[PDB]
Amino acid sequence: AFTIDFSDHTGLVKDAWYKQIEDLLEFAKKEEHIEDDAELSVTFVDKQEIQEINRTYRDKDKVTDVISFALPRVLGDIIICTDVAQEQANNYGHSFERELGFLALHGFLHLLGYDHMTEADEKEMFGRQDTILNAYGLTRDHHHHHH
Ligand SMILES: [Zn+2]
After folding, report:
1. 38-45 and 2-8 as β-strands: parallel, antiparallel, unpaired?
2. Ligand 1 center to residue 107 CA distance, Å?
3. What does this protein do?
């Protein structure tokens, strides 16, 4: 099994988008060969709230697109900023909800223990990200964040 506890503090997220994001992350969990039951939470917030969360939890007084908090396997929490995701979606040329899904996938891989702070880690983690997105059908280069 795989359950996402979703929350949307903005009222912007459509019900169809929750399903699209959950289906992508469930596919990723299977591609990662995680057989156990897993659970996680995804919360959508506006730019004022993401800055406050970034300030108090990361000592970064600034807006950002996604924050992941790593801890049935309980994987932790992903927080996504709708304001930033909408602008990044415009810059990459896919929809708001596609960008929400990409940021959720990125956070999910972080919760599994991947990181990209070194070149070797980045190659491993973006290699998995690209492979999952391609296997799901998201093969256009900018759906990978050109990455
Ligand atoms: Zn990251």
Report:
1. parallel
2. 7
3. Single strand-specific metallo-endoribonuclease involved in late-stage 70S ribosome quality control and in maturation of the 3' terminus of the 16S rRNA.
β-sheet bridge partners, residue 70 = 76
Q: In the CATH scheme, what is the code of domain 2-144?
A: 3.40.390.30
* Coil vs helix vs strand at 30: helix
Ligand 1 centroid to residue 42 C-alpha, Å:
15
Q: Among all chains, which residue has been given the structure tokens 């730019």? A: 47
Annotated binding site for Zn(2+): 106, 110, 116
* Domain spans, the chain: 2-144
Q: How many CB atoms lie within 10 A of CB 93?
A: 10
Are the C-beta atoms of 63 and 50 separated by less than 8 Å?
yes
Resolution in A: 1.9
